[PDB]
Amino acid sequence: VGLGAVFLGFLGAAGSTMGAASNTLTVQARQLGVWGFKQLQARVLAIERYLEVQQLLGMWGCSGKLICCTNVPWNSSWSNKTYNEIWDNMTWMQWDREIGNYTDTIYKLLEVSQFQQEINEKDN
Amino acid sequence: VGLGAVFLGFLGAAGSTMGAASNTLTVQARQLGVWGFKQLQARVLAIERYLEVQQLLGMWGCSGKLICCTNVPWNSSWSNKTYNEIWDNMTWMQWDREIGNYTDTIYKLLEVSQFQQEINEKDN
Amino acid sequence: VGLGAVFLGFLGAAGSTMGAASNTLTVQARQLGVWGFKQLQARVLAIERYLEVQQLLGMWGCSGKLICCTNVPWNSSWSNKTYNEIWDNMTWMQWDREIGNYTDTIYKLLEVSQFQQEINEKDN
Amino acid sequence: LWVTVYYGVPVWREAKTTLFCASDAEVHNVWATHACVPTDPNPQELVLENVTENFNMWKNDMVDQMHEDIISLWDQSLKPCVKLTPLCVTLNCSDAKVEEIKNCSFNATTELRDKKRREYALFYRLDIVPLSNNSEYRLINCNTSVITQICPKVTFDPIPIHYCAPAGYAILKCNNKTFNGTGPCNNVSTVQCTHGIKPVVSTQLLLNGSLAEEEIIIRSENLTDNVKTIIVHLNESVEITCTRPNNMTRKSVRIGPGQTFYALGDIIGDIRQPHCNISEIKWEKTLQRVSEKLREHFNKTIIFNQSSGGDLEITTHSFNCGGEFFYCNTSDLFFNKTFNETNSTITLPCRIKQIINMWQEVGRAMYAPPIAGNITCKSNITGLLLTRDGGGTKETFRPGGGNMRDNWRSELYKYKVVEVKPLGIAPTECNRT
Amino acid sequence: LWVTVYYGVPVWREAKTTLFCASDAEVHNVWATHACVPTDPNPQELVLENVTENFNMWKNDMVDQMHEDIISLWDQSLKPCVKLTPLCVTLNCSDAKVEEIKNCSFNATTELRDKKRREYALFYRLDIVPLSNNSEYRLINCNTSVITQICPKVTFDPIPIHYCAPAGYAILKCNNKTFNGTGPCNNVSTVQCTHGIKPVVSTQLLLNGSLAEEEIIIRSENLTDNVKTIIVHLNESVEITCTRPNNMTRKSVRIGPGQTFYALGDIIGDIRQPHCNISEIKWEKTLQRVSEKLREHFNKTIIFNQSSGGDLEITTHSFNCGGEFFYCNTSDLFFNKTFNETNSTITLPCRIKQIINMWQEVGRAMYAPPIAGNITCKSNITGLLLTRDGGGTKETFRPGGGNMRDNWRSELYKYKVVEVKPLGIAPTECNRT
Amino acid sequence: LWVTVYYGVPVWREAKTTLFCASDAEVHNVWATHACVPTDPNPQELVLENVTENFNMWKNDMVDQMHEDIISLWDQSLKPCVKLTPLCVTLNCSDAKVEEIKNCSFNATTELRDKKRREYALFYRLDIVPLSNNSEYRLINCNTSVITQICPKVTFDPIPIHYCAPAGYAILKCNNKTFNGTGPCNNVSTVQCTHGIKPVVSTQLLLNGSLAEEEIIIRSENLTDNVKTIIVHLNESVEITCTRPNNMTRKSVRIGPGQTFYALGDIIGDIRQPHCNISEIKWEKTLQRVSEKLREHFNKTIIFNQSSGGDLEITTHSFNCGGEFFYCNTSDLFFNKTFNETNSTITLPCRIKQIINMWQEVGRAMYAPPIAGNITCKSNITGLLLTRDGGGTKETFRPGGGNMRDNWRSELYKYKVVEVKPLGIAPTECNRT
Ligand SMILES: *[C@@H]1O[C@H](CO)[C@@H](O[C@@H]2O[C@H](CO)[C@@H](O[C@@H]3O[C@H](CO[C@H]4O[C@H](CO)[C@@H](O)[C@H](O)[C@@H]4O)[C@@H](O)[C@H](O[C@H]4O[C@H](CO)[C@@H](O)[C@H](O)[C@@H]4O)[C@@H]3O)[C@H](O)[C@H]2NC(C)=O)[C@H](O)[C@H]1NC(C)=O
Ligand SMILES: *[C@@H]1O[C@H](CO)[C@@H](O[C@@H]2O[C@H](CO)[C@@H](O[C@@H]3O[C@H](CO[C@H]4O[C@H](CO)[C@@H](O)[C@H](O)[C@@H]4O)[C@@H](O)[C@H](O[C@H]4O[C@H](CO)[C@@H](O)[C@H](O)[C@@H]4O)[C@@H]3O)[C@H](O)[C@H]2NC(C)=O)[C@H](O)[C@H]1NC(C)=O
Ligand SMILES: *[C@@H]1O[C@H](CO)[C@@H](O[C@@H]2O[C@H](CO)[C@@H](O)[C@H](O)[C@H]2NC(C)=O)[C@H](O)[C@H]1NC(C)=O
Ligand SMILES: *[C@@H]1O[C@H](CO)[C@@H](O[C@@H]2O[C@H](CO)[C@@H](O)[C@H](O)[C@H]2NC(C)=O)[C@H](O)[C@H]1NC(C)=O
Ligand SMILES: *[C@@H]1O[C@H](CO)[C@@H](O[C@@H]2O[C@H](CO)[C@@H](O)[C@H](O)[C@H]2NC(C)=O)[C@H](O)[C@H]1NC(C)=O
Ligand SMILES: *[C@@H]1O[C@H](CO)[C@@H](O)[C@H](O)[C@H]1NC(C)=O
Ligand SMILES: *[C@@H]1O[C@H](CO)[C@@H](O)[C@H](O)[C@H]1NC(C)=O
Ligand SMILES: *[C@@H]1O[C@H](CO)[C@@H](O)[C@H](O)[C@H]1NC(C)=O
Ligand SMILES: *[C@@H]1O[C@H](CO)[C@@H](O)[C@H](O)[C@H]1NC(C)=O
Ligand SMILES: *[C@@H]1O[C@H](CO)[C@@H](O)[C@H](O)[C@H]1NC(C)=O
Ligand SMILES: *[C@@H]1O[C@H](CO)[C@@H](O)[C@H](O)[C@H]1NC(C)=O
Ligand SMILES: *[C@@H]1O[C@H](CO)[C@@H](O)[C@H](O)[C@H]1NC(C)=O
Ligand SMILES: *[C@@H]1O[C@H](CO)[C@@H](O)[C@H](O)[C@H]1NC(C)=O
Ligand SMILES: *[C@@H]1O[C@H](CO)[C@@H](O)[C@H](O)[C@H]1NC(C)=O
Ligand SMILES: *[C@@H]1O[C@H](CO)[C@@H](O)[C@H](O)[C@H]1NC(C)=O
Ligand SMILES: *[C@@H]1O[C@H](CO)[C@@H](O)[C@H](O)[C@H]1NC(C)=O
Ligand SMILES: *[C@@H]1O[C@H](CO)[C@@H](O)[C@H](O)[C@H]1NC(C)=O
């Protein structure tokens, strides 16, 4: 039951500032037929959308951490605004326009910078 | 293969005391047709029952810990018996009668009390 | 998309030595119809092959660690070669011949030796 | 200062996906086959705050996922009952003596294919075509399409179905009252699945639909067009009452081994017309209020006119009622009136057809069995379907349906399915120490 | 003192789910289509200790998931072979000269639909119905149901299938010996999938079933009822031997283009009856041991009696044998005996039918092709099917089947599917420091 | 010193799995039904280094997953159009007057099953069989198989399909140039899905296939065998040109209610043969280069010979061209030549059939509608299909196909699907402290 209800629950305050979505979430979280084939086609997609974001989390050294904090330097060719300009004067939907063309080069960079943590310090 | 065999293996000593199921588990763990649609309908349900309990674990800060220990105070309006009365004089099937009407109010409480751990100490 | 591309990406340098596959991976990681039923039968198998290895990882106290290091002593009735003989003079495909008949007795041993870590030190 | 990730951020993207049914919880039915998930007794709608999302009505995808599966639903339901292939022979029909209904007498095969009984039935004049008059008819379209009959146990009564998106998707829903059909509306709320949608089938006047809020809405795509239709939503429900007062008597006849069907026997009493009724003062004010909401979008006078003509699926008001398919005239005291500046009753003449070619295609033609006794259905007209003339002074609006997807584009005028992307990336102060 | 969770605790809940097949590993077959998972060579059963779980037999769900998919299995198998629609015409039958078997001669169409050869076949008197005598017959039910024939390559021999629950579910299994059908039993063991279940089809006496353990079990639902049947499980297997000693000769006839079927040609030698055999001393003691186990549940004398009568699917012992469907009398020296306080052989007369209406429904009627040469099948009678009379002195038990789900409710009398809920919540001393 | 695990190690194992389609992105088509995933615009192949993996060609599984789903594809496509069951009656055919083409005249039923018009069509002599001559023919195989016709909208033009393994599997691909069909090759590269495979249908000479690299490859299974065929891959593409210069006129005739089909009307102008063309100097050198690559594997002289004979699907060169099915002689100036030590043109006579029994089975027989006007298709012969005689001096090779799976075993001669096992176990120094 709790496989897509949390996905719908993420959309609370979708127009608020980016520095408020980490704050104003706790204020709202206080309280063979034809359809036999449509439901199967729906359930496979519902599983696949969860597993895709799960593998995308699992490659970055955090598999259940919400605010996962990674050791990758911020390349300023992707954005040029400071922390106080982004986090207090933008909504989360508007951020995906500026970051929307450097997604895969950040994803692969995060993957290899997490792979270096396993190679370097642990055993080798 | 090991996707529901462990689910069947959990049922060892289903009539023992609650303080023995954590002990007497190591003593036993020492050693297109019609059916083409029935098997597909079975496999989707077998995946979904595993992913539902996986998300229910993943929301509480432990995603593979067996005895996961959480920082939620015990509200005594749910049960009034002590630790020595519950854990040594009850089976695990009998506990689900007493706790059986406060399940969702414990689940949402565990979720928000885990969300506070990410907000408070880590970065914000 | 990234659900089997990493599975194909694991096969880089499949003929190299075992002590080089942990090294020479970073050098290459720098940069209703008939088919409507075939694709559904393919997607269920693609999910199941990922979840089987995920549960097999999750039973051993590491659910996203790549080089997971476990506290099980090496029984020398499985292999008799030293570390410098195995890791520098063998490929990874050739290792599965020597270890290929002691797989399940290592898997169950790893499971119970991880279960002892939860029973002993944490709470009980 | 360093890259960090965030699970669960409010970021969506418009997409195309596969929805499913949800009924409100035992004879078989073509719409909900008693194989649907039970609905939420209290649906959880999450109202958004201070966000403007623009979405198109005519470029939707749910209205194409609604015209496809309904076709598949009738394909699934009309499969396991008998086709009327060996029925149509050289019929010998004169009239009924109780011109509208002919007394046909033909040679059907009995239960074994060696004897032939002559069996009589009664058909409508809108259902047989002559061959020479000389009175030798045949069935209307057993030359282009194989004709099946409806399995007589199932019903057509539209119970409302809900369309739920899969887990991990969202359905937006505009809550603005005066929402013109295409543009940005600033009161948006997400819902897992929509309200009750009755899958009603009509082509001229919309029936049993949800009313508008506090205004008359004029939904279109290009108002300077001639082929693009004009959906006129309503906020004043006008009641219609359609009935036939004849007491029909069905009769079973056998055409093949294990193959039987039902046809009209004799008619009880004096024959009377099937008619529909519309209150006059509840209709004149409705046309006047629509006329003022159409004058300002053209800045000239408008004048309603008759339909075009031709076949009797375009110049009529076709609808379903209790298991019978009507075809009413709808162009007598409705659409010959202009607009300047007594409890009467308008009666529309209406004719009934047995064999119908639904969704105006070839290869599919169902046959409706007759219904014993009279029927009477009272409904709500919330919505029209107009079409501009093609002139260019004044204005002339032919009332005529463009398709059947426009019949679904009134209950789905405020929904768009999106896919959430809960992964966010932001710079912050922390680094993985 | 603080809430903690536990993964993998022994907590289950009764539920309803979808099971699947598992055969014991090449002609086609209707039961196992060679599309089933291979079984475990050694199944792992986990015996539970010191737990009493109560489960109902008649309120099961596997016995409704067994009557549905078998219907779907015969629907899947009888699809791609020929229907006998153009077969039944005005037949012209007199007798065979070798009253039980008639020599019918009819007009079938040849490979092209312009010529008609008269072709002869041989049918049973229990398979044609007259029309006037005057000797003009027709096939028995080509007026209510379209009739198909069995594809002649497939077989009906019941190989045992195993029903496996999905991964994440459990199937309980009672191990008590004297288990009355409904109540709590205290020796429970979980198993992933059940033992070998032969999908046998019978209606009067159960065949090839698993015997009881060390007692005679009398399973019922309400023993103070009259319409609820009484399943009498057994622990003494009584051997039955059923055969027909006639050497039948099949013969191919063609009825349509690419459409042929097989019918009985001539019969070799002198005609003899098809009969069944039951040893008398192995049957008198079996009825006496059942009679004592029924006297104590009514505290009056019991007396067996004949069946009711009517159609020949209720007052008979219908079963399948080697690809032929029998209908034996079963009420001659079995059910006219009371109970007070030589190696003989009881012979039952038995008649054979070709066209059978299995599962007593309409719309489905298969035709069995004849089998060349004699057949002989030896089986085990482990189970009866009795029914109380409806009086209320003494007692009278009509031997008669109530349904066909009761034929599965002997091999599934000790299984219930449950869903494990491995999440537990308990208070303890630790807190997340 | 202690056991540690490793996620993602290069370990595979040979397995059997279910692949799927991928086309290169609108009339319907039998091969790609416009329901296939779009391909990668640039496929990612990962070349392996210093590894020898041996795989068999004839023991593959993709060539059995290719012969099954193509059968299912034609089964899916030939379902919803009309079967020619009531067509074949006693035909009355004499000749055309424009022996190869007969003018047949028969009695079809009109749109209502009470009148019969006599309608004429034109059939080929290779398509009707006589009954007595006396000139009364019938259609060729409406005695063993029900015959359907092709739905006339769909096409047969082979667009290439790609076979993608599921996520979590790998498809190896050998990159060696001179790869004999079975053995270890040492230049292996993994690919998610293979190159474009045209699903061409031929039985004598391979058409439109991928050429070899820099040599002539002689693929076989046992070269000391007589029934095992010999696939001879090529590296010199020889162009073939096949055409018929007659201007055929199709004609619609109606046989049932809603059931019509198309047949040949009259032929425009003087009748001419359908022939194929092969350049002589591009063929003599090709046979000589194959002859030298076959002499060294037998160490005796080889001599090509004619085909065996019998039915006209084995001793011919059957192929498809533009929607018409040819059957050419292919044994006139190709296979009567030995080998010692002018821009001419070889013309092969070729005959056309309408009704074809593809994949040499019973129960399925499609009918091809005629094509208006002439057709001309130019193709590439990359591959032969030879068979040893069975003697044992010299050698004789009958050119003749063994199956249709061998037609797929040229485009799948270098692919094997494997399943990765990314869990590795090794001893190391660390322990879980
Ligand atoms: C309840 O349980 C009883 C158990 O006895 C079942 O009885 C068996 O029924 C099957 C089905 O009729 C019988 O199997 C058939 O046996 C025929 C004769 O068997 C001879 O050959 C075998 C070879 O090993 C010997 O072992 C045996 O002793 C005999 O010498 C076979 O001919 C059949 O095989 C093939 O026959 C023809 C070809 O001639 C094919 O068309 C068939 O498809 C088939 O492939 C078949 O194997 C079996 O013999 C019976 N057991 C006996 C007599 O002990 C009941 O069927 C079962 N179910 C009920 C009553 O519903
Ligand atoms: C092996 O490989 C050869 C490669 O040559 C294939 O040969 C091709 O076969 C196809 C199918 O017959 C041919 O495609 C058809 O061409 C017709 C004529 O093409 C003219 O128009 C195109 C337009 O771009 C020009 O490029 C071309 O030069 C010609 O001027 C078309 O008319 C067909 O299109 C439509 O035709 C009718 C309408 O008239 C429709 O009913 C059809 O459905 C279709 O939509 C069609 O495109 C192609 O021309 C051939 N290539 C040539 C001659 O070079 C073999 O088919 C292939 N396979 C084997 C042998 O099995
Ligand atoms: C936006 O739409 C929502 C949903 O219709 C409105 O919320 C409702 O407002 C009415 C009247 O004020 C209340 O009776 C309801 O309780 C409200 N909630 C719901 C869930 O229906 C809201 O008022 C609208 N806001 C604007 C600015 O138009
Ligand atoms: C409960 O049932 C189990 C299963 O039948 C019994 O265990 C078997 O007992 C017999 C006889 O003692 C042994 O031969 C078997 O080895 C036992 N195990 C199995 C797996 O069959 C058990 O005895 C029963 N207990 C009670 C109290 O009735
Ligand atoms: C092994 O096969 C690969 C793939 O064909 C060869 O790699 C190609 O070689 C050619 C010619 O040297 C280059 O033009 C290509 O760029 C190479 N790569 C690809 C992806 O095609 C390789 O040369 C072969 N090696 C051996 C030893 O045969
Ligand atoms: C309302 O909008 C303002 C700016 O448009 C925004 O700062 C605020 O967060 C919004 N309200 C809520 C409840 O998000
Ligand atoms: C690509 O990046 C540019 C920044 O140069 C951005 O403006 C644009 O929106 C991005 N996305 C596109 C072109 O889809
Ligand atoms: C047997 O039952 C007692 C109490 O009923 C319980 O304490 C004990 O644990 C049970 N035996 C096993 C092996 O669980
Ligand atoms: C609900 O809670 C009560 C405690 O007051 C409990 O007795 C009952 O079993 C619970 N469950 C129900 C009513 O299903
Ligand atoms: C080439 O082979 C040698 C030994 O066969 C091996 O050591 C080396 O790693 C291989 N090359 C690569 C790139 O793996
Ligand atoms: C089993 O173990 C032996 C070691 O004694 C090994 O040689 C063999 O390859 C293994 N695998 C088998 C027999 O499949
Ligand atoms: C119609 O025709 C039938 C015979 O064809 C006749 O018996 C009957 O009286 C006629 N009239 C009506 C009203 O049925
Ligand atoms: C009219 O139809 C009704 C519908 O059931 C029926 O009860 C009645 O007998 C019919 N005849 C008359 C005269 O009312
Ligand atoms: C049955 O009838 C046929 C002709 O209809 C005849 O040839 C045959 O002798 C008769 N008797 C038997 C036993 O077949
Ligand atoms: C009887 O049937 C058997 C069964 O195959 C056959 O072999 C035999 O020839 C038949 N006739 C006689 C006279 O036994
Ligand atoms: C074929 O026969 C038809 C009549 O059956 C005739 O009209 C026609 O002239 C004949 N010849 C040709 C070439 O069609
Ligand atoms: C021959 O066929 C072509 C194909 O379209 C057609 O255009 C032409 O009219 C036909 N007749 C002649 C005489 O070319």
Q: What is the DSSP string of chain B?
A: -TTTHHHHHTTTTTTSBTTTTTTTTTTTTT---SHHHHHHHHHHHHHHHHHHHHHHHHTTT-SS-SS-EEEEE--TTT----HHHHHHS-BHHHHHHHSTTSHHHHHHHHHHHHHHHIIIIII-
- What tokens were used for E253? 């006839």
Q: Do B112 and A29 touch (CB under 8 A)?
A: yes
Q: To test the ligand 13 pocket, which listed residue (D266, D268, D374) has its Cβ within 8 A of the most ligand atoms?
A: D268
Nearest to A94 by CA among D187, D182, D426: D426
83-102 of C, contacting F, C-beta below 8 A = 83, 86-87, 91-93, 95-96, 99
Separation in Å, CA of F59 to nearest CA in chain A: 33
Is some CB atom of chain D closer than 8 A to the CB atom of E89?
yes
Of ligand 5's atoms, which has the minimum distance to the CA of residue F175? 2
Of ligand 17's atoms, which has the minimum distance to the CA of residue F374? 2
Q: CB of B120 closer than 6 A to ligand 9?
A: no
* Ligand approaching nearest to the C-alpha of C15: 10
DSSP reduced 3-state for E48 = coil
Residues 6+ apart with CB under 8 A from F300: F393, F394, F395
Nearest by CB: A122 against C3, C32, C67: C67
Selected for mutation to probe chain D from F79, F112, F153 (highest D CB count within 10 Å) is: F112
Find the closest chain E residue to C123 by CA distance: E430
* Spacing, Cα D375 to ligand 12 middle (Å): 25
- What tokens were used for F162? 């790609």
CA–CA dist B35, B37 (Å, integer): 5
Pairing of strands F37-38, F20-23: parallel
Considering only CB atoms, which chain E residues are within 8 Å of C123? 4, 428-430
- What tokens were used for D232? 């006129």
Q: In F24-145, which ranges are E strands? A: 37-38, 45-47, 53-55, 92-93, 101-109, 116-124, 128-130, 137-139
Is some CB atom of chain E closer than 8 A to the CB atom of D111?
yes
Are the CB atoms for D329 and D348 separated by under 8 Å?
yes
Is some CB atom of chain C closer than 8 A to the CB atom of B100?
no
Evaluated on CA atoms F281, F285, F286, F288, the torsion sign reads positive
Position of tokens 């009452």?
Answer: D241
In angstroms, what is the C-alpha Rg of chain B? 18
Q: To test the ligand 15 pocket, which listed residue (E244, E246, E247) has its Cβ within 8 A of the most ligand atoms?
A: E247
Position of tokens 């008359």?
Answer: D216
Residues comprising chain E, all counted: 433
Are the CB atoms for D23 and D193 separated by under 8 Å?
no
Strand order in the sheet with D37-38: D37-38, D20-23, D162-164
CA–CA dist C98, C105 (Å, integer): 14
- What tokens were used for E314? 């209720």
Identify the chains in contact with F, defined as 3+ C-beta pairs within 8 A. Answer: A, C, D, E
CA–CA dist B40, E20 (Å, integer): 10
CA–CA dist F271, F290 (Å, integer): 38
Nearest by CB: B7 against E420, E426, E431: E420
Separation in Å, CA of E19 to nearest CA in chain F: 23
Q: To test the ligand 14 pocket, which listed residue (E91, E99, E101, E103) has its Cβ within 8 A of the most ligand atoms?
A: E103
CA–CA dist F317, F242 (Å, integer): 12
40-59 of B, contacting E, C-beta below 8 A = 41-43, 45-46, 49-50, 53, 56-57
Nearest to E199 by CA among E18, E30, E365, E399: E30
* Spacing, Cα E122 to ligand 15 middle (Å): 19
Separation in Å, CA of A31 to nearest CA in chain B: 8
Nearest by CB: C67 against A41, A62, A123: A123
Residues 6+ apart with CB under 8 A from F428: A123, C69, C83, C87, F1, F2, F4
* Ligand approaching nearest to the C-alpha of F380: 2
CA–CA dist D356, D145 (Å, integer): 12
Q: Do B38 and E425 touch (CB under 8 A)?
A: no
CA–CA dist F398, F390 (Å, integer): 10
Single-letter amino acid, residue F154: V
What are the backbone dihedrals phi and psi of residue E285, each rounded to the nearest 5 degrees, phi first? -70, -30
Residues 6+ apart with CB under 8 A from E188: E47, E48, E51, E53, E172, E173, E174, E175
DSSP reduced 3-state for F224 = coil
| A:C CB pairs within 8 Å | 49
Residue nearest to atom 2 of ligand 4 (CA): E175
Is some CB atom of chain B closer than 8 A to the CB atom of A69?
yes
Residue nearest to atom 46 of ligand 1 (CA): E322
DSSP reduced 3-state for D237 = coil
CA–CA dist F279, F285 (Å, integer): 11
Cβ neighbours around D281 below 10 Å, total: 10
Considering only CB atoms, which chain F residues are within 8 Å of D86? 113
For residue D14, give Cα distances in angstroms to D54, D172, D418, E95, E210: 11, 10, 4, 77, 60
Of ligand 10's atoms, which has the minimum distance to the CA of residue C13? 14
3-42 of D, contacting B, C-beta below 8 A = 4
Q: Is B60 left (phi over 0), alpha (psi -120 to 50) or beta?
A: alpha
Q: CB of B16 closer than 6 A to ligand 8?
A: yes
- H or E stretch covering C56: helix C35-58
- What tokens were used for E411? 């091999």
Q: CB of B101 closer than 6 A to ligand 9?
A: yes
DSSP reduced 3-state for E135 = coil
Considering only CB atoms, which chain A residues are within 8 Å of C63? 63
Considering only CB atoms, which chain B residues are within 8 Å of E172? none
Are the CB atoms for C75 and C101 separated by under 8 Å?
no
Is some CB atom of chain E closer than 8 A to the CB atom of C121?
no
Architecture of the structural domain at D2-79+155-246+259-423: Beta Complex (2.170)
Q: Helices marked H in E147-208 — which ranges? A: none
Are the CB atoms for D316 and D126 separated by under 8 Å?
no
Nearest to B10 by CA among D182, C40, A3, E8: E8
Helices (H) and strands (E) in chain E, counts: 3, 33
Q: What is the resolution of this structure in A?
A: 3.7
What are the backbone dihedrals phi and psi of residue C63, each rounded to the nearest 5 degrees, phi first? -125, 55
Instruction: Report the first-to-last Cα separation within chain B, whole angstroms.
Output: 43
DSSP 8-state class, residue E208: S
Pairing of strands E384-388, E230-232: antiparallel
Nearest to D250 by CA among D270, D268, D236, D265: D265
Nearest by CB: F257 against D88, D90, D363: D88
Rounded to the nearest angstrom, the gap between the alpha carbon of residue D274 and the centroid of all alpha carbons in its chain is 20
What are the backbone dihedrals phi and psi of residue E306, each rounded to the nearest 5 degrees, phi first? -65, 170
By what technique were these coordinates determined? cryo-EM
DSSP 8-state class, residue E178: S
* Spacing, Cα F322 to ligand 2 middle (Å): 7
* Ligand approaching nearest to the C-alpha of C101: 11
Neighbour-count burial of A109, counting CB atoms closer than 10 A to its CB (0-12 exposed, 13-18 middle, 19+ buried): middle
In angstroms, what is the C-alpha Rg of chain A? 18
Identify the chains in contact with E, defined as 3+ C-beta pairs within 8 A. Answer: B, C, D, F
Considering only CB atoms, which chain A residues are within 8 Å of D430? 69
Is some CB atom of chain D closer than 8 A to the CB atom of F260?
no
Q: CB of F96 closer than 6 A to ligand 16?
A: yes
Are the CB atoms for E386 and E399 separated by under 8 Å?
yes
